[PDB]
Amino acid sequence: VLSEGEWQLVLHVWAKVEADVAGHGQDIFIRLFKSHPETLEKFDRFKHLKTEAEMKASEDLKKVGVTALTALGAILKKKGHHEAELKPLAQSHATKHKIPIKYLEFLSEAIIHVLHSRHPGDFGADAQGAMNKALELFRKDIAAKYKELGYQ
Ligand code: HEM
């Protein structure tokens, strides 16, 4: 369970993401696909993209990044009281998209890496620790919902 101070460190870096969620989403998903290329295979609409240049030019990828980061932002703003938000997300990601928890870990790693590079003013060590806590909580709770839904 995060403290309010930890939540505020999370939200204060998220405020910078929200200056340009589209550009942050491109950096984050491109980092994910470069570090873990198997994750790109889950996106039937753009799994054919071959290079970072093609990824940066893809409007479909840009929209996926906006949608995902905005949904994550809504979860973070609930400061752990995210039961309602996790229901539809767990159901689609477990049952339709088939996204292992390990891939959510990979995405969390990409988020941390991009925030560390882009936001040293709001992503020092304590802030990064708070974001890790928040993402670990998200993954813990969504893993429990995956299990309820029949996806180990
Ligand atoms: C913080 C974690 C994530 C959030 C908040 C998130 C959020 C979303 C949302 C809101 C949608 C659209 C509605 C839906 O189908 O549920 C979506 C679609 C999708 N997500 Fe995620 N997502 C996350 C992680 C991932 C990861 C790691 C992958 C794959 C490695 C993934 C794969 C997909 C796919 C394949 C779709 C459909 C995309 C399309 O229409 O082209 N998601 N996600």
Furthest-apart CA pair in the chain: how many Å? 43
- Of 31, 112, 104, the C-alpha closest to 68 is 104
Q: How many angstroms separate the CA atoms of 144 and 59, rounded?
A: 33
Q: Is 67 in the pocket of ligand 1 (CB under 6 A)?
A: yes
Task: Give how far Cα 18 sits from Cα of 78, 102, 122, 141, Å.
Answer: 16, 26, 13, 24
Instruction: List, in order of start, the domains of the chain with CATH numbers.
Output: 4-149 (1.10.490.10)
Q: Is 9 in the pocket of ligand 1 (CB under 6 A)?
A: no
CA distance 14 to 139: 18
Which method resolved this structure?
A: X-ray
**Centroid of ligand 1 to alpha carbon of 93 (angstroms):** 7
CB 14 within 8 A of CB 76: yes
Q: Is 104 in the pocket of ligand 1 (CB under 6 A)?
A: yes
Q: What whole-number distance in Å separates Cα of residue 13 and Cα of residue 6?
A: 11
How far apart (Å, rounded) are the C-alpha atoms in residues 38 and 51? 14
CA of 97 to the centre of ligand 1 (A): 8
Q: What is the resolution of this structure in A?
A: 1.1
Angle between helical axes of 21-35 and 59-77 (0-180°, round to 10):
100
